[PDB]
């Protein structure tokens, strides 16, 4: 049953058993409750005037927070950050869902949903201690199509930034797009001044991760019709998944969540992306690519 299915869900989840994501298609709600793990979050939007902003509070029970929420999406808008429980990982808000739409995580796992801003990145910072031993908490990007998301590791703490455009930009996400990535991850860092000036790709953003992070995850999209997003270095520490690739698929979406669990005492972290088609009427999803990562 979809109760039994669920609990056996969250038992998996609770051991680290990032298995019970696969092939399940993206986990996203525009839902907001309040969840147990503290974590910072900051947002880093190209407008006119530039926008920044840092938040060191909680997200509390209904009740989204203005400078991160679209207004451009929707009757009323939707978050561009929000937090939610387990009971119902995905809504009728999200297209790339399919099981999670049915089956659940139970209200014992916390969710933590980070998509870009309209045109820029938004991310988080949130340390591994935070996690308690039966309370699973997961990271999730909602539905890539085109975007790009990145999670890293330093000293104790896992960071996960989002970044692209709501709007037709062509060649944002991988220029513009870096730039505020890297901004954000600069003000999680404790540099309120962050200064990127030079030359922006997503090379870019592989030489900033590999030296300045201990490890780390791409999850993008790369295309021969927008070069900068083509990435040609390569980087011991620095790991990369393209979801898209050109023109493929030509109708789908990718993913990206993070679940943080402590396990035994010992706090593990996965990481896990995906890359899915869909069909003219977007009723069924197939997973086409997958990315496993343990940080």
Same mark, same amino acid.
């Given at each position: +049953?979809? $109760?039994?299915?669920?609990?056996?869900?969250?038992?998996?989840?609770?051991?680290?058993?990032? *298995?019970?994501?696969?092939?399940?298609?993206?986990?996203?709600?525009? #839902?907001?409750?309040?969840?147990?793990?503290?974590?910072?979050?900051?947002?880093?939007?190209?407008?006119?005037? /530039?926008?920044?902003?840092?938040?060191?509070? #909680?997200?509390?029970?209904?009740?989204?927070?203005?400078?991160?929420?679209?207004?451009?999406?929707? =009757?009323?808008?939707?978050? &561009?950050?929000?937090?939610? &429980?387990?009971?119902?990982?995905?809504?009728? +808000?999200?297209?790339?869902?399919?099981?999670?739409?049915?089956?659940?995580?139970?209200?014992?796992?916390?969710?933590?949903?980070?998509?870009?801003?309209?045109?820029?990145?938004?991310?988080?910072?949130?340390?591994?201690?935070?996690?308690?031993?039966?309370?699973?908490?997961?990271?999730?990007?909602?539905?890539?199509?085109?975007?790009?998301?990145?999670?890293?590791?330093?000293?104790?703490?896992?960071?996960?930034?989002?970044?692209?455009?709501?709007?037709?930009?062509?060649?944002?996400?991988?220029? &513009?797009?870096?730039?505020?990535?890297?901004?954000? /991850?600069?003000?999680?860092?404790? $540099?309120?001044?962050?200064?990127?000036?030079?030359?922006?790709?997503?090379?870019? /953003?592989? *030489?900033?991760?590999? $030296?300045?992070?201990? *490890?780390?995850?791409?999850?993008?999209?790369?295309? %021969?019709?927008?070069? *900068?997003?083509?990435?040609?270095?390569?980087?011991?520490?620095?790991?990369?998944?393209?979801?898209?690739?050109?023109?493929? =698929? %030509?109708?789908?979406?990718?993913?990206?969540?993070?679940?943080?669990?402590?396990?035994?005492?010992?706090?593990?972290? #996965?990481? /896990?992306? %995906?890359?899915?088609?869909?069909?003219?009427?977007?009723?069924?999803?197939?997973?086409?690519?997958?990315?496993?990562?343990?940080?």
């Amino acid at each position: +049953s979809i $109760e039994s299915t669920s609990k056996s869900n969250f038992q998996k989840l609770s051991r680290g058993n990032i *298995d019970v994501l696969k092939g399940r298609g993206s986990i996203s709600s525009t #839902r907001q409750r309040a969840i147990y793990p503290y974590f910072e979050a900051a947002n880093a939007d190209e407008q006119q005037p /530039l926008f920044f902003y840092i938040k060191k509070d #909680r997200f509390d029970n209904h009740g989204y927070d203005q400078y991160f929420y679209d207004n451009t999406v929707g =009757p009323n808008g939707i978050p &561009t950050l929000n937090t939610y &429980t387990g009971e119902i990982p995905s809504d009728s +808000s999200s297209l790339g869902s399919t099981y999670w739409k049915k089956y659940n995580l139970t209200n014992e796992t916390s969710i933590i949903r980070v998509s870009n801003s309209a045109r820029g990145a938004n991310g988080i910072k949130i340390a591994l201690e935070e996690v308690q031993e039966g309370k699973p908490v997961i990271i999730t990007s909602g539905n890539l199509s085109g975007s790009t998301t990145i999670v890293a590791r330093k000293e104790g703490y896992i960071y996960k930034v989002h970044t692209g455009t709501t709007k037709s930009l062509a060649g944002f996400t991988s220029t &513009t797009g870096v730039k505020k990535a890297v901004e954000v /991850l600069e003000l999680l860092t404790k $540099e309120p001044i962050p200064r990127v000036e030079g030359i922006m790709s997503n090379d870019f /953003l592989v *030489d900033y991760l590999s $030296e300045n992070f201990e *490890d780390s995850l791409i999850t993008y999209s790369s295309s %021969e019709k927008k070069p *900068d997003s083509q990435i040609t270095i390569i980087r011991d520490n620095v790991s990369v998944f393209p979801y898209f690739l050109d023109n493929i =698929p %030509e109708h789908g979406f990718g993913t990206s969540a993070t679940v943080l669990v402590r396990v035994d005492g010992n706090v593990v972290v #996965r990481s /896990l992306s %995906e890359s899915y088609s869909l069909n003219a009427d977007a009723s069924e999803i197939s997973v086409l690519k997958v990315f496993s990562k343990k940080f």
